[PDB]
């Protein structure tokens, strides 16, 4: 008459959590070579 349930025995254990995130790589020190002189 009494039912028959199915248990899981949950036990405390440490977890980490990390999330992926987008983004674009940029150069470290880019120099836009641009003149300081008018001429040909």
């Amino acid at each position: 008459q009494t039912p028959e349930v199915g248990i899981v025995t949950l036990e405390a254990q440490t977890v980490t959590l990390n999330t992926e995130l987008p983004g674009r790589t940029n150069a470290f020190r880019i120099a836009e070579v641009r003149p300081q002189v008018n001429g040909i």
Partner: protein
């Protein structure tokens, strides 16, 4: 290369111990407030009005 009076900012320095909060109220709401505060059906708050 960096030129004089450059429109592009090199870095941005901001401090936030207070923060301005810019809040937009529609003008018809201010106009119905001006219509209802003049009549007696809505009294001005006073000392607590700024919070």
């Amino acid at each position: 290369l960096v030129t004089n009076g450059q429109a592009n900012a090199m870095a941005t320095v901001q401090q936030l111990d207070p923060i301005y909060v810019d809040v937009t109220q529609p003008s018809t709401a201010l106009l119905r407030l001006r219509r209802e505060l003049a009549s007696g059906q809505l009294e001005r708050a006073g000392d607590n009005a700024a919070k």
